[PDB]
Amino acid sequence: TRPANHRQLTFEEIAKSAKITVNKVELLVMKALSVGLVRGSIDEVDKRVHMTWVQPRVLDLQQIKGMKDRLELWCTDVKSMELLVEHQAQDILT
Amino acid sequence: NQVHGLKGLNSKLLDIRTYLEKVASGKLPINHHIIYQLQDVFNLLPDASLQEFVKAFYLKTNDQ
Amino acid sequence: LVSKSVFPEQANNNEWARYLYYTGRIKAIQLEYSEARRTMTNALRKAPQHTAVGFKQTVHKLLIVVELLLGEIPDRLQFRQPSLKRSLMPYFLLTQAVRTGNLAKFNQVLDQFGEKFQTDGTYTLIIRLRHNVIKTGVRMISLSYSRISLADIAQKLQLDSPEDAEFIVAKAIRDGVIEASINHEKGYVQSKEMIDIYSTREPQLAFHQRISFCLDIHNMSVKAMRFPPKSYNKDLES
Amino acid sequence: LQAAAGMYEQLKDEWNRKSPNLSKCGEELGRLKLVLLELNFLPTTGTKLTKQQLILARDILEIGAQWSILCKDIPSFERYMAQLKCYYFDYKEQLPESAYMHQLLGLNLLFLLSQNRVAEFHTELERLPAKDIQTNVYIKHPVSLEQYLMEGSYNKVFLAKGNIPAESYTFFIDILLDTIRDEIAGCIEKAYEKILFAEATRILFFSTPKKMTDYAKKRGWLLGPNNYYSFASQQQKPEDSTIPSTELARQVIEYARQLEMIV
Helix, strand or coil, X not given: CCCCCCCEEECHHHHHHHCCCHHHHHHHHHHHHXXXXXXXXXXXXXXXXXXXXXXXXXXXXXXXXXXXXXXXXXXXXXXXXXXXXXXXXXXXXX | CHHHHHHHHHHHHHXXXXXXXXXXXXXXXXCHHHHHHHHHHHHCCCCCXXXXXXXXXXXXXXXX | CCCCCCCCCCCCHHHHHHHHHHHHHHHHHHCCHHHHHHHHHHHXXXXXXXXXXXXXXXXXXXXXXXXXXXXXXXXXXXXXXXXXXXXXXXXXXXXXHHHHCCHHHHHHXXXXXXXXXXXXXXXHHHHHHXXXXXXXXXXXXXXHCCEEEXXXXXXXXXXXXXXXXXXXXXXXXXXXXXXXXXXXXXXXXXXXXXXXXXXXXXXXXXXXXHHHXXXXXXXXXXXXXXXXXXXXXXXXXX | CCCCCCCCCHHHXXXXXXXXXXXXXXXXXXXXXXXXXXXXXXXXXXXXXXXXXXXXXXXXXHHHHHHHHHHCCHHHHHHHHHHHHHCCCCCCCCCCCCHHHHHHHHHHHHHHHHHCCHXXXXXXXXXXXXXXXXXXXXXXXXXXXXXXXXXXXXXCCCCCCCCCCCCCCHHHHHHHHHHHHHHHHHHHHHHCXXXXXXXXXHCCCCCCHHHHHHHHHHHXXXXXXXXXXXXXXHHHCCCCCCCCCHHHHCCHXXXXXXXXXXX
């Protein structure tokens, strides 16, 4: 949902939310990866769990909104970038 | 092919967004597969690194 | 006049060498040793063979001085090899004075040989070289071994004080020559240096400029090459 | 009064080193102009014949120059000073005369330096030599300073003690001094973290901790009564750590496009 630009999450966020101790969250996060809700690696010393991938989920209220936002960012970049690619290398461009 | 590629991506990319709108309002039936696949595209993202070229091409040419 | 001009490449090889020598000479006085060295090194190389020889020796006198001004200590063989070795002998001595960092040899040489230097035209640059004698020594030592006490640099060069050294570092740092900083937390000079540039994007840039620079020349290489045989084929021959 | 050589030079002498005045030696300097138009219609061609006219030319502009320096106005001085120089160069120092030229000459050297017009400074250095024709007392101040300043012995300068001997030089010496103090002041920030107040007065060319507090504050260190060198210093030391990645790569696409086109 929330990050287009990043995909890493801190533990501390879970911890406060749950109101469950820090020691448990590291262990809970490990179960999360094993089920396959998320795939990635956990780096303890940076205090992040980095998601390489997120499981598909059936239509949710938060979800549909994020997808649109990311498609918009994507359209805009592709048009800007198209001008750069076309602008340079004139002699092969035909 | 690379110049065209960017243009191709744009033509395809618009459709994906209108489809998402239709489901939201202007009611259209959801094909579940499509929604499942969409979310996958955004998650793989990393940032860029290196790649560069040497002074060597010039040396040969100067020899001639 | 130098600033305004870039200098195009259609004009013969002898004339280019004259353009570079003159340019190099003037700029260095200001303390623009950096641009001037490039021109002078190109100048020597641009000149002709045996006919050139009289201009070449004057250019060879100026050349050691401009490369010395940068913070480099030129090669000793170079002075030796042209067979103007004798005339080159004070220029080599100036290079040695810069190596040790001692004022006393540098100052006495400048005066004795001053009659010979004035003749070449080099003398104006030679006064600016006094700064370099101490400057080259401190950059050499700091580069090699990063953290050294302020007291240690003072003895080596024969400077007045640990302050006297700190002030050399202060003028330099902004320009970037010595490239170190003074930490008066205990009194040492600490070098900026670190290493592991290949886990950072920064090398792609280094290479990128080198290729861009090469590139404009490559289009030029193909183009120029064909022109002279074609002129000769167009010319009528027996 | 009315002045022009061969019949006047009253005002040069009356201006300073007799009594202070410029209320006759620069207030009446508007009618001197009218003879100047004649005089200046002749060093189009710079020859030895022109000499006679040339010394009269210089004379108003030496008194002109002198009123400007005392008055503490740098721009007026600059217009007056500039004329005298071209009027020396007519076989390169044809006129190196008068001791009411002497002061101007030294002043001109330090003046160029305060602006940090490095090119002009060298141009004058070479043009001028009358530093032993009119002999090293006040003219000595820029000369000492060039040797020291090039060597990088800031301690040796003889510009933070060239305030005390002055003809009316003290003003020029002060603006040039302020330039010297700044150059060092910014650098030191990068140099090291929170260092003593006393250490930060010593090699900051300051006279007291009070002068240092106000001067440091504008620069961006010692905003409070505690050093703040530390912000600046830390940024410089690691050069090999910085990856915003895409931002730093600086458009790989452009370089590639330049490269591909030829083949």
